[PDB]
Design a protein around this ligand. Structure first.
Ligand SMILES: CCCCCCCCCCCCC(=O)O
Length: 162
């Protein structure tokens, strides 16, 4: 348990649709440094299921090309927290959203012990939302982040933010 900011009263159905990964930050440089870095992922679309699971469409750079991926984040007993099925358990936490402009989320490694953490500022449009980025930075000020990336509008409209 490293992230202790969650969205109270989250309605997961309302996060459906298009998003842009405006900014990303990680606990370890190596998680985001290279274009093929493991957590360098660009969100395309969130697709909540009727049962309240979260299907994620995203792009990731793999083997000299921008590849599409579909991920399922299963719900928990906590509305703001989901689990991605992988070799080691990976929790997704929604920190904060207004549904209509921005959503802040982190994903963390369950046990390391120190553990890895990547967070993103998502926005609905290919625009630099300074207010959303302020909420992102304020949310991260406590967290032990060592790399931060942000994208311009031109980049946001390209596959893998080229
Ligand atoms: C509420 C928004 C949640 C978005 C979560 C995105 C999770 C991405 C997980 C990375 C997996 C890496 C891979 O496909 O190789």
């Amino acid at each position: 348990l490293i992230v202790t900011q969650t969205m109270k009263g989250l309605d997961i159905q309302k996060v459906a649709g298009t998003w842009y990964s405006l900014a990303m930050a990680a606990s370890d440089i190596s998680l985001l440094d290279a274009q093929s870095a493991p957590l360098r992922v660009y969100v395309e679309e969130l697709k909540p299921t009727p049962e309240g699971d979260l299907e994620i469409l995203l792009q990731k750079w793999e083997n000299g090309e921008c590849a599409q991926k579909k991920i399922i984040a299963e719900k928990t007993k906590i509305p703001a927290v989901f689990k991605i099925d992988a070799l080691n358990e990976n929790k997704v936490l929604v920190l904060d959203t207004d549904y209509k402009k921005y959503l802040l989320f982190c994903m963390e490694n369950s046990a390391e012990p120190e553990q890895s953490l990547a967070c993103q500022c998502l926005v609905r449009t290919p625009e630099v939302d300074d207010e959303a980025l302020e909420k992102f930075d304020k949310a991260l000020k406590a967290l032990p982040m060592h790399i931060r990336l942000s994208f311009n509008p031109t980049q946001l409209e390209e596959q893998c933010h080229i």
